[PDB]
Amino acid sequence: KMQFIRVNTLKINPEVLKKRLENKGVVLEKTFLDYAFEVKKSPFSIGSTPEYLFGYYMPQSISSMIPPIVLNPREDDFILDMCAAPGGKTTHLAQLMKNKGTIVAVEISKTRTKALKSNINRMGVLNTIIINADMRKYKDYLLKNEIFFDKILLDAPCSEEDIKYCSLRQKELIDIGIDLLKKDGELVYSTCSMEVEENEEVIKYILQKRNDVELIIIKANEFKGINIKEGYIKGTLRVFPPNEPFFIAKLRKI
């Protein structure tokens, strides 16, 4: 697997971090993002450095950096990250928002909520409210209190079944997501799963189910150097090896 790091601009400039790691023997190659680098060689585990401890970067695939960029949160947005642990994307969203606005990050597992909180704290993220809850229940609390979102990320991982619910209930959850959006709001659905009922079929499900949602065409053009192209629904994207497999789609409530 190719190793990449996302430099945390909430805390450090990318070129400054790059040099600091190069001085320790790490070899870093540019990517399409001025704040992400491909780790070509490193004399030590990338997650064992004081720089990682200090929250100067997040080790994660470059494919996993795409959903937050596609969602493209505004600094003043109110955002929901439905299946947030471990928090790589949650913290990326906070960086894009320059720590302004609010991200509500939900995680059903008490154990994974600890990892999520650890990353948020390590990365210096201040705008995120961590909720340890099941979205199928918490959505009733949001709805009854009229708490709607400007944008929502439903990035699905790839009882025990409740713990893994976001890898199984993507159709149910994307529908909950549209219920939680303000009119004109946007939701990005992403997942590293390539299962047949977990990529395009989730999108076909929701477009057929609801008359208040439409697809937003995502273009592959800006993602230079990534092996990415369209899914079998125009406007959706799939990433292929050598990058981490990933599916990404974007919807708007109308």
Q: Which residues are catalytic?
A: 192
86 is in an annotated binding site: yes
134 is in an annotated binding site: yes
Following CA atoms 105, 108, 114, 115 in sequence, which dihedral angle do they give, to the nearest 10 degrees?
A: -70
Phi, psi at residue 203, to the nearest 5°? -70, -45
Burial state string for 141-156 with b = 16 or more CB within 10 A and e = fewer than 16: ebeeeeebbbbbbbbb
177 is in an annotated binding site: no
34 is in an annotated binding site: no
**8 A C-beta contact, residue 174 and residue 186:** no
81 is in an annotated binding site: no
107 is in an annotated binding site: yes
249 is in an annotated binding site: no
Tell me how far the alpha carbon of residue 210 is from its chain's centroid: 24
Cα gap 26→42, rounded to integer Å: 4
88 is in an annotated binding site: yes
Binding residues: 83-89, 107, 112, 134, 155, 169
Binding site for S-adenosyl-L-methionine, by residue number, is 83-89, 107, 112, 134, 155, 169
